[PDB]
RNA sequence: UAUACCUCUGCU
RNA sequence: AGUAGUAACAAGAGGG
């Protein structure tokens, strides 16, 4: 009965050559760590050290520091996949549950609703595009609906179609041996973003994604029937969760998301080949009751051999919009924005007349991307669960269900935005809908840039927290703190928006504070 | 009124409202294209923060390895990897005076593990560099592979089954002058068909012998790719994957790193959440009762920058023997492998880089084995500079790397050192006017700092600080910070006066997770339940997790409920199993049915929750054991998912095997390359392992041991099974001679 | 038959390819090539799924799927295909044969499936059966804690597991070890009796098995049960801010019962001792108390538990103690002292270690067993004297062999030979002692050791060799020929007047109870445990606070002795309890004194420990102890501690982490340099001043004469600046 | 419930 | 060289 | 064009 392990000389040798510097052998110093005892060997080489060699603490005053710094540069432009605030629908009243019927069937009983179409003109050109492309497109799509028979619409590949969804725009893969010598052969653009400027437009994005509407826009899948009291009790709070949250503004936004991500996906996968029509439909249920099929647009699908997860499906993405894009042009520049008809419009005792624009413009995503736009709804639950422990927060103190009081009583409220006037408290139901504006505009505009500013700048928030727990916080280098979070303010719409409005938490701070 | 969310921390602080600070509902940043730009900006660096160190030659790889142990003490607060040997063993030995026999039992645990782990041990495990055929592979193929091209060569003492032996023929492979590899080509024949002739592409295998380099190289290599899905982080990282020499030599060192943290109340590695926060709320109640009335607390929310780039595998040498002093040279020299491959590693630079000419409209491939001979006219500056440098350091298409430590090599040893030098803060040893105590895993660290005055604080911290330089550790003072005990975060744990939720990090666990039909019903429930648990999430958002959960599970796979007017693939097959159906809320959700669940079931199984109100016949035909859409798997990985939070765990599940536990097709990609035969070879080893269990059942529950020949056993077995089952049984006598003539039929064939 | 396995072995060894492998590969290695795969881990599988679930054949299934549905269904959906999966002979599949298959595939029967998958139905059993109560909202402490998480774990180890598994499932094919004790042959025997004939995958059971059997443990923050049938369900019956009361269907486990039973006990004494007639509120609280739905009353009634505070309550429900058993043969009647119990093993002269449940504490029994009888008195293994009488010398000899194995020396276990062994129950190890001095005692009275004795009249000693001497015996040996009353005070006595058992002396350490408590009684908070008490008691300060405020400074007396404080004062040390009250109510009379200075978070904070007669003593305190959980805390006399912190972010009074409810906003803006409260005869005026000299520690400040000022560490690490004030205080 | 806002 | 087609692949 | 963001996609490979 024994046991061995040896090394074999090339072992040894590498063994031997893998110490510290002041030996010459693995023999001599796993004697040397066999037989080492301490004797102050910490103590010496700490006297021996530099004492440059330091973390000094440097107590920390959100009083003293100052406001983040946001860029400089052209303006951001929107990114969004569809239209937020400037989205108009065309829709009829259908007895039809929240996905239910023929997407074209739908969307070509909804065009049904409109007359007063008009022959299409460029009213707002995307610059570096060929615009006639789009107005081509546009036309093409329009005769093509008309004239179909089925389930599926496929466009044929003509040329302004294909220039929109860059067929052919991949250059051909050759052996470097063959294509060694080229002059301008270089590696690709591998730059930082361009920089961008914060602009009016996100912040009113935001600030109608946090109102309420006239419809019901989640439907919910059902539950087992309610046992334990605690269930029923859940079913109770869970009616005004309900309610707040599926007529919020933001959960049209998801169930855009959803069907348009969902529908990408599936035709990528299926019709790989084919430039296939998707409509951009929701349904809803008014406040009155009554079901509604929408339509606000189409996309067009290019081709979609998407491999790799970050892989690229070009679409065009034509949107119905009574925005004038002239009033706020910097926001428009990747679109094409067209005219195309002239509506009608109901107001309290008066018909309007409003020119009907189409907004235009080549986009493309990715399995990862339409993946996570499919799973949008999980923005509820963050939302809610925020809400839910605040409102249990005060049910331990209170020692009843305080449900009830906090969204019919207005008692309670929060500081969630500011006016001339100052800073402005909401209901519970309000911050249930800013935070879930909050969420849904984290996935609508999901970035690297929001990653790290987000993560950053949350060592800044406790920070202030620290001070106003009185806790006597203290930095070593917040100097490079505020580099890690600036170094992600780059040309992020949302990420300028949120660097904003930590300036403006950090100023109201020091206002009601020194 | 523009709305601002960042208001609310005006009234809420910002612990209990830290949801909103979370971005979790978007999808993630990923990489697109290579990782080399990054391997070589963590190459450099390593050896920039080490710069000061001594540089050699190596006798048998002649790669260029920086040593900076026991180097020059820095003299800036930059990031240094001048660790101290001495130092270093100075508080390892603290860590056994503190901790008697800790050490002992630990390394005999790890004893008794080598004496008994067998070669098996290496299927199991995340992917693997493999040197056979220079990329990633499974565990298993990687092992499958390196044995066989042992095999062809010299080297058999893994037949014996134990995983010592297989580590012995690794270092006697060294020695080999000609290492023998087959490769596989495409060849290009001509056929004729009926009436023209058509090209053939095909596949033929062509040996080669490699250098005394080259297999050296190979076998000190470890692969690199970019970091996907990572959050929190602006710019994307390097990581990597060690290869089939060293993986069997770092199990066992992460064993005794293991076996020594589960032992260390400041250890965070490798207990769980829960334990997590019940270690740190315990050293607070511990720093609280053994300081007086008059005395501070402070508490640092720690991380350490850069600290896989900072440690090194010459000090792990020194940790392993000094924490297996007194043992067996045998076992001492055997853990010292992994710290030693460690301290010659290679790095793989990726997939290289790709080009492009808008003149010409064309795009071209170039591997960073071409890094070294090449013209720098198409690249940038900085990739252009990054280029200059790593070639002093490339070989054989490597890049030397002998300094510092890459994400995704090693896991526990390092943080041994961290608490070390938490363990040295002890009022006995420090016998200052502070003191202090923590938790630590890896780069993350909680430390609390007790003295009589705010003063005393500075020194504490300066002198675990520099202590912490000393050995290579370097606290980021761009994101650490301190306050007053009370308030701390801990690996996105907030402690304010104990532990609150912090449920975002959990959202992108919600959703149905494709595993099958049957699995994420399971997985589905679960994750909302140890929510509810674990994170506050309330019963009425709990409810709607469930509503959106099933409302997800219904479209991913078409299995809306039979009543639905909905129309897809499924919509005709399932309305008739609804028409059908007389009890429907028996009904699978994956059938058309009803969901079931509430708060109460969510910890019930489906199929268990509705047995009772199935119809006899769909029952019989759900839960049929004959049905041909099951895996049968081993026991061992049944009921088994894996999910991503670590680097990468197991998820077991609570599920009734029926048809809804399929799994979905395999990738096909490798049809069109060099290596589509080892479809075959599975496809060949799968029938043998199928045959083989017919004859030893119990094989796909315990692994069976035995150094003899799967034929020979299964002959062995068909003898005597036939015996018995006619000697005292119910098989006649004419089939016993119609069964053991085969099995000497069998016996000719050899 | 066996027939078509070989037949197909024979099939597979003609391709050279098969038999190539078959003979080259060993056992060992096949393990390995089983594993031999080009598919790797999906890492991203919730996006493949949803790419694939859009695609037409995304499942595979064996190609035996061919013979057994059609290619096609009743509405024309291709069912599957002949297309081969990546790596085997498997073929890919669409959805819509699954969903045939079960509306028209072949049935088989399953109903014998619950008894496979027993461990998921208990479960479902449970629930079915469980019961509702109401839902009370409160601040609900959770302490993370290892906990089982598999109700039902027939108690084994991993390996004894396996050999029962290997039995039940693959009986041929078991290795070399055998069932090892009466649990493995039990389960064994009734797995493979409720199993037989199940058409089910054997490698299904096997799994289910292994699940059921092994204990398996998590950490998981729990409120009160912590039962695994509880632990099950902890979703259901607590979150943050709410407890929905349960009872899962089954029946508790003693073990179970027992342990809440004495924690039950234990805080109605705790809770008794402090209120004016402690044996009215025991009686009240035993009346109204209920352990899992279960009145407390008619437990008592019929538990055996032998523990002091359960005997405090037995005696006043007049019900018995358990105060005596039998072992031996004889009868062991306790008559003074207490049984407090500690697990442990000790090696043997033999070298053998034995886990033993040894004894702790001065014990004395009165032992008789027909023909011998004996007065005892014994140690933690000390048998400090035995007075035994009898018919004959061999039946006191066989009670004193019986005494010297009850009392646990060291002596006697160092005396023993040999390995201990005997039986087919098994006897427990202190029979494994006693059997083998039984039989054999000649080391025994060896090595027990012999003193000399003064000679008495009526008593002779006893040598190791069996003869009777008057002035030498066997250490500890000589040789010679309950109604319980309770009073006011909860002191349980003798017929003779002496004491039995005292409330004082009941255990402090304290524990979480594995079974639900419900109190039922307004001498009780709604919540079990001391974090409750601290967390209801400053919630009721504060709520009530303005009456409180006004009854502070008109009728202090009143307020101090409210009952809502008595809880409170079971978390302060017995003795402390009237120091801390002269400190508190002197510390607010100077409040009273000193004008100006008025700290009503100050009073809030201490007003609890007002609430005892206070003694007059003039020490000094920087905080006040409690005990919580077992570990003491301390509650800073200036400023926030954990116990106590006001945070004026927030406006709310913190209780070990927990909002105890908002002050006044008044408060927040409400300041004065000086601060009455602290210090007891002394003043802070405001920062240090070195003017008046070095620092001084807080024992230190007896030299100060009335009026000098002086600087003090206070607490903190803050120094202050401190007058000693002129006339005291009521 | 139905919500509302000013 | 251009234009049709045809086959395999969609994490390999 | 567009996606995108420190490097890629804008089909790859083959029937040469
Ligand atoms: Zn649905």
Same mark, same amino acid.
């Given at each position: ?514 | ?750 | ?337 207490? =049984?407090?119990?500690?697990?442990? %093993? /000790? #090696?043997?002269?033999?070298? *053998?270690? &034995?886990?033993?449940? +040894?004894?702790? $504490? ?5 032992? =008789?067993?027909?023909?011998?009888? %004996? /007065? #005892?008195?014994?140690?933690? *293994?000390? &048998?400090?004297?035995? +007075?035994?009488? $009898? ?340 | ?6």
């Amino acid at each position: 009965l024994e046991e061995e392990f040896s090394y074999p000389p090339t072992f040894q040798r590498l063994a031997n050559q893998s110490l510290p510097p002041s030996f010459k052998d693995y023999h001599q110093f796993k004697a040397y760590v066999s037989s080492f005892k301490a004797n102050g060997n910490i103590e010496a080489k700490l006297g021996a050290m530099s004492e440059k060699v330091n973390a000094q603490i440097e107590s920390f005053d959100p009083r003293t520091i100052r406001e983040l710094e946001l860029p400089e540069g052209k303006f951001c432009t929107q990114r969004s996949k569809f239209l937020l605030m400037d989205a108009m629908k065309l829709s009829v009243l259908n007895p039809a549950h929240e996905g239910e019927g023929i997407p074209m069937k739908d969307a070509k009983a909804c065009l049904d609703t409109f007359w007063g179409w008009k022959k299409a003109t460029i009213i707002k050109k995307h610059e570096k595009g060929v615009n006639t492309n789009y107005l081509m497109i546009w036309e093409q799509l329009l005769e093509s609906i008309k004239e179909m028979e089925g389930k599926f619409l496929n466009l044929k590949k003509t040329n302004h179609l294909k220039w929109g969804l860059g067929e052919g725009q991949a250059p051909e893969k050759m052996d470097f041996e063959d294509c060694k010598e080229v002059p301008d052969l270089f590696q690709y653009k591998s730059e930082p973003p361009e920089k961008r400027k914060l602009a009016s437009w996100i912040q009113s994005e935001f600030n109608k994604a946090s109102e309420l509407t006239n419809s019901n826009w989640i439907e919910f899948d059902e539950l087992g029937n309610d046992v334990a009291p605690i269930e029923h009790i859940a079913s109770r709070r869970r009616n005004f969760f309900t309610a707040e949250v599926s007529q919020c503004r933001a959960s049209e936004y998801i169930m855009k998301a959803v069907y348009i991500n969902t529908a990408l996906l599936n035709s990528s996968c299926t019709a790989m080949e084919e430039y296939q029509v998707i409509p951009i439909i929701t349904k809803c249920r008014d406040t009155s009751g009554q079901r509604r099929t929408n339509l606000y647009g189409f996309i067009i699908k290019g081709r979609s051999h998407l491999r790799n997860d970050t892989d690229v499906v070009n679409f065009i993405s034509l949107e119905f919009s009574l925005t004038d894009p002239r009033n706020e042009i910097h926001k428009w520049e990747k679109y094409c924005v067209l005219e195309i008809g002239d509506m009608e419009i109901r107001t309290s005792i008066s018909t309007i007349m409003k020119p009907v624009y189409l907004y235009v413009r080549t986009n493309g995503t990715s399995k990862i991307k339409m993946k996570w736009g499919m799973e949008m709804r999980r923005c509820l639950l963050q939302s809610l669960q925020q809400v839910e422990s605040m409102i249990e927060a005060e049910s331990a103190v209170k020692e009843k269900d305080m449900t009830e009081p906090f969204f019919r009583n207005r008692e309670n409220d929060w500081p969630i935005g500011e006016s001339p006037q100052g800073i402005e408290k909401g209901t519970i139901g309000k911050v249930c809908r800013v935070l879930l504006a909050k969420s849904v505009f984290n996935s609508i505009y999901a970035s690297a840039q929001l990653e790290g500013f987000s993560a950053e700048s949350r060592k800044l928030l406790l920070l202030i927290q620290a001070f106003r727990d009185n806790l006597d916080p203290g930095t070593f280098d917040l100097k490079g703190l505020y580099e890690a979070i600036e170094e992600c303010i780059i040309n992020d719409p949302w990420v300028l928006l949120n660097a904003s409005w930590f300036n403006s938490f950090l100023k109201a701070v020091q206002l009601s504070m020194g | 009124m523009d709305v601002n969310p960042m208001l609310i921390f005006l009234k809420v602080p910002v612990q209990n409202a830290i949801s909103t600070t979370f971005p979790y509902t978007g999808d993630p940043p990923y990489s697109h294209g290579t990782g080399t730009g990054y391997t070589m900006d963590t190459v450099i660096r390593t050896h920039d923060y080490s710069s000061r160190g001594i540089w050699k030659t190596n006798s048998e790889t002649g790669a260029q390895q920086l040593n900076p142990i026991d180097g020059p003490l820095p003299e800036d607060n930059e990031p240094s990897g001048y660790a101290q040997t001495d130092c270093v063993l100075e508080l390892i030995e603290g860590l056994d005076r503190s901790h008697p026999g800790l050490f002992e039992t630990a390394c005999q645990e790890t004893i008794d593990a080598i004496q008994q782990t067998r070669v098996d041990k290496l299927t199991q495990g995340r992917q693997t560099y493999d040197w056979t055929l220079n990329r990633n592979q499974p565990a298993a193929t990687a092992l499958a592979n390196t044995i066989e091209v042992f095999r062809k060569n010299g080297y058999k003492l893994n037949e014996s089954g134990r995983l010592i032996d297989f580590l012995k023929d690794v270092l006697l492979s060294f020695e080999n002058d000609s290492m023998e590899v087959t490769t596989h080509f495409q060849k290009k024949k001509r056929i004729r068909d009926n009436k023209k002739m058509i090209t053939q592409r095909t596949i033929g295998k062509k040996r080669v012998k490699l250098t005394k380099k080259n297999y050296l190289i190979r076998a000190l290599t470890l692969n690199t790719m970019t970091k996907d899905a990572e959050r929190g982080k602006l710019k994307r990282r390097a990581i990597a994957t060690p290869g089939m020499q060293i993986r069997g030599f770092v199990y066992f060192v992460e064993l005794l790193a293991r076996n020594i943290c589960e032992r260390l109340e400041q250890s965070g590695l490798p207990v769980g959440g829960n334990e997590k926060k019940a270690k740190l709320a315990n050293v607070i109640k511990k720093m609280m009762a053994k300081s007086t009335d008059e005395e501070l607390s402070y508490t640092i929310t720690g991380d350490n920058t850069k600290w896989n780039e900072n440690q090194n595998p010459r000090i792990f040498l020194a940790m392993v023997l000094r924490i297996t002093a007194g043992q067996p040279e045998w076992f001492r020299d055997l853990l010292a492998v992994a710290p030693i491959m460690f301290s010659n590693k290679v790095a793989r630079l990726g997939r290289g880089y790709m080009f492009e000419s808008k003149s010409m409209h064309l795009r071209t491939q170039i591997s960073a084995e071409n890094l070294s001979d090449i013209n720098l006219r198409y690249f940038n500056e900085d990739t252009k500079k990054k280029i200059e440098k790593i070639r002093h350091l490339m070989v054989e298409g490597t890049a030397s790397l002998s300094p510092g430590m890459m994400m995704g090599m090693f896991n526990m040893l390092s943080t041994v050192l961290g608490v070390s030098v938490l363990n040295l803060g002890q009022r006995e040893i420090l016998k200052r006017t502070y003191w202090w105590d923590g938790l630590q895993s890896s780069d993350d660290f909680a430390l609390i700092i007790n003295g009589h005055f705010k003063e005393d604080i500075q020194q504490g911290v300066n002198h675990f600080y520099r202590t912490c330089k000393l050995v290579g550790i370097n606290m980021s003072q761009k994101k650490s910070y301190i306050n007053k005990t009370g308030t701390f975060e801990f690996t996105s744990f907030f402690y304010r006066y104990g532990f609150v939720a912090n449920f975002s990090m959990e959202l992108p666990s919600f959703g149905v997770a494709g595993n099958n039909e049957s699995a994420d019903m399971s997985i589905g429930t679960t994750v909302i339940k140890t929510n509810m648990i674990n994170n506050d999430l309330g019963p009425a958002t709990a409810q709607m997790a469930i509503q959106l959960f099933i409302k997800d599970y219904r479209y991913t796979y078409r299995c809306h409920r039979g009543d639905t007017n909905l129309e897809t693939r499924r919509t005709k097959s399932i309305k008739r199993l609804w028409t059908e159906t007389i009890s429907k809320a028996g009904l699978l959700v994956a059938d058309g049915g009803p969901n079931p669940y509430n708060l109460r079931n969510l910890h019930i199984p489906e199929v268990c929750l509705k047995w009772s109100l199935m119809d006899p016949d769909y029952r019989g035909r759900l839960c049929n054991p004959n049905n041909p859409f099951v895996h049968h798997m081993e026991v061992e990985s049944t009921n088994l998912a894996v999910v991503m939070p670590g680097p990468a765990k197991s998820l077991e599940y609570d599920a009734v095997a029926t048809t809804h536990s399929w799994t979905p097709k395999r990738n096909r990609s490798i049809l069109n390359t060099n290596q589509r035969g080892i479809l075959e070879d599975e496809r060949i080893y799968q029938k043998c392992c199928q045959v083989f269990e017919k004859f030893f059942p119990s094989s796909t529950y315990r692994r069976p041991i035995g150094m003899a020949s799967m034929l020979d056993a299964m002959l062995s077995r068909a003898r005597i099974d036939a015996r018995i089952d006619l000697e005292s049984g119910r098989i006649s006598s004419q089939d016993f001679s119609e069964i053991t003539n085969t099995c000497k039929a069998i016996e000719a064939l050899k | 038959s066996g027939m078509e396995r070989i037949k197909e072995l024979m099939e597979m060894v003609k391709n050279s390819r098969m038999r190539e492998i078959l003979t080259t590969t060993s056992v060992d290695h096949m393990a390995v090539i089983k594993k031999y795969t080009s598919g790797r881990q999906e890492k991203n599988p919730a996006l493949r799924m949803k790419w694939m679930m859009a695609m037409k054949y995304p499942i595979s299934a064996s190609s035996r799927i061919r013979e057994m549905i059609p290619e096609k269904d009743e509405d024309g959906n291709t069912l599957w295909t002949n297309t081969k999966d990546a790596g085997s002979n498997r073929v890919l599949v669409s959805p819509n044969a699954v969903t045939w298959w079960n509306r028209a595939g072949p049935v088989s029967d399953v109903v014998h499936y619950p008894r496979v998958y027993k461990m998921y139905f208990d479960r479902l059993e449970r629930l079915t059966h469980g019961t509702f109560g109401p839902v009370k909202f409160y601040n609900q402490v959770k302490v993370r804690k290892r906990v089982d998480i598999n109700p039902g774990h027939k108690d084994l180890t991993s390996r004894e597991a396996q050999e029962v598994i290997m039995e039940v499932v693959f009986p041929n094919e078991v290795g070399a070890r055998t069932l090892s004790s009466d649990a493995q042959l039990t389960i064994t025997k009734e797995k493979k009796e409720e199993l037989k004939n199940c058409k089910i995958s054997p490698i299904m059971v096997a799994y289910m098995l292994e699940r059921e059997l092994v204990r398996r443990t998590r950490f998981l923050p729990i409120a009160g049960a912590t039962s695994s049938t509880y632990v099950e369900v902890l979703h259901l019956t607590q979150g943050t801010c709410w407890e929905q009361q349960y009872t899962p269907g089954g029946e508790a486990e003693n073990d179970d019962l027992d342990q809440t039973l004495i924690i039950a006990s234990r805080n109605i004494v705790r809770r008794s001792i402090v209120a004016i007639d402690p044996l009215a509120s025991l009686l009240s609280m035993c009346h109204t108390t209920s352990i899992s739905s279960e009145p407390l009353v008619e437990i008592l009634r019929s538990n055996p538990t032998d523990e002091q505070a359960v005997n405090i309550c037995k005696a006043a429900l007049g019900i018995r103690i358990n105060n005596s058993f039998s072992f031996g043969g004889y009868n062991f009647k306790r008559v003074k002292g207490s =049984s407090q119990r500690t697990e442990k %093993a /000790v #090696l043997t002269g033999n070298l *053998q270690t &034995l886990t033993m449940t +040894i004894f702790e $504490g001065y014990e004395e029994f009165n032992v =008789s067993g027909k023909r011998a009888s %004996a /007065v #005892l008195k014994k140690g933690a *293994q000390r &048998l400090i004297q035995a +007075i035994i009488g $009898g018919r004959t010398l061999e039946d006191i000899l066989n009670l004193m062999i019986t005494l010297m194995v009850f009392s646990q020396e060291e002596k006697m276990l160092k005396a023993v030979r040999g390995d201990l062994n005997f039986v087919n129950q098994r006897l427990n190890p202190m029979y494994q002692l006693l059997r083998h001095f039984q039989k054999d005692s000649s080391t025994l009275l060896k090595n027990w050791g012999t003193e000399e004795i003064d000679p008495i009249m009526g008593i002779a000693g006893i040598m190791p060799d069996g003869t009777i001497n008057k002035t030498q015996t066997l250490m500890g040996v000589r040789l010679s020929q309950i109604r319980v009353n309770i009073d006011k005070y909860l002191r349980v006595r003798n017929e003779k007047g002496e004491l039995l058992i005292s409330p004082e002396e009941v255990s402090e350490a304290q524990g979480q109870e594995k079974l639900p408590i419900n109190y039922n009684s307004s001498l009780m908070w709604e919540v079990n445990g001391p974090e409750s008490i601290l967390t209801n008691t400053y919630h009721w300060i504060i709520k009530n606070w303005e009456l409180l405020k006004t009854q502070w400074m008109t009728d202090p007396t009143v307020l101090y002795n409210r009952i809502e404080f008595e809880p409170f004062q079971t978390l302060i040390p017995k003795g402390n309890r009237a120091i801390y009250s002269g400190f508190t109510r002197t510390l607010f009379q100077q409040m009273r004194d000193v004008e100006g200075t008025f700290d009503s978070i100050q009073i809030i904070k201490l007003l609890p420990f007002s609430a005892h007669p206070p003694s007059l003593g003039r020490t000094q305190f920087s905080s006040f102890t409690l005990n919580i959980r077992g570990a003491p805390l301390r509650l800073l006399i200036r400023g926030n501690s954990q116990v106590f912190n006001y945070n004026q972010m927030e406006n709310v009074i913190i209780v070990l982490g927990k909002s105890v409810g908002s002050p006044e906003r008044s408060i927040l803006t409400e300041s004065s340099s000086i601060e009455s409260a602290v210090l007891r005869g002394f003043l802070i005026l405001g920062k240090a001043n070195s003017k008046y000299g070095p620092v001084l520690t807080i024992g230190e400040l007896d030299k100060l004469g009335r009026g000098e000022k002086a600087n003090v560490l206070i607490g903190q690490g803050d120094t202050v600046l401190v007058m000693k004030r002129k006339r005291d205080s009521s | 419930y139905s919500p509302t806002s000013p």
